[PDB]
RNA sequence: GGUCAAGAUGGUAAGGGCCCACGGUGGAUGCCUCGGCACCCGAGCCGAUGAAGGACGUGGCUACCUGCGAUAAGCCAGGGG
C-alpha cells in the first residue's frame, strides 16, 4: 500500500496518534482470531504489523522534524 | 559252505587344525570439498547519539542456526536491478 505510504504523509499529530493507536487495536483483533478465520488472516496479521510500523516511521519523521 | 586259532588293516567327530567359497560387525581409505594454514597487497580504529559483549523476545503455525527487538521472516528515503 505504497498508497498508504500516502495517507501517512497526509495525517499529524492526534491524527496520526489516535490512527495507528486503532489501527494497533484492529492487530489485536487479529491476536484474538489466533484460533479462528486464520487462513486469508494471515495477512492482516504481517502485513498490519509493518504497516503500523511505518505508522511510528511516521510520527518519528513528523515530530523529529519538530524538536 | 560252516565252525575255531592266528595275523594285518578300515570307516565311523562332540569339537578342533591348514585350505576355498560365501556373509556380518570395523572403517582403512582413493578421491573429493562452501575449512584451515603460509606469504604478499589491501585495510587499521570501537565507546555513552551508553560500544565491544550478552540476557529475555518476534517471525500464522517455530526448541533450534538467522536477522531484527516491542514499530522485532523487519518501517523510511535515496543509490543499484
Redesign the pocket.
Known sequence: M?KQ?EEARKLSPVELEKLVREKKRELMELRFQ?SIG?LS??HK??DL??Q???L???L??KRRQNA
Do not use: G, H, S
Open positions: 505504497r505510504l489466533a486464520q488472516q494471515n496479521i504481517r504489523k509493518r503500523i510500523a511505518r511510528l516511521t511516521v518519528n519523521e
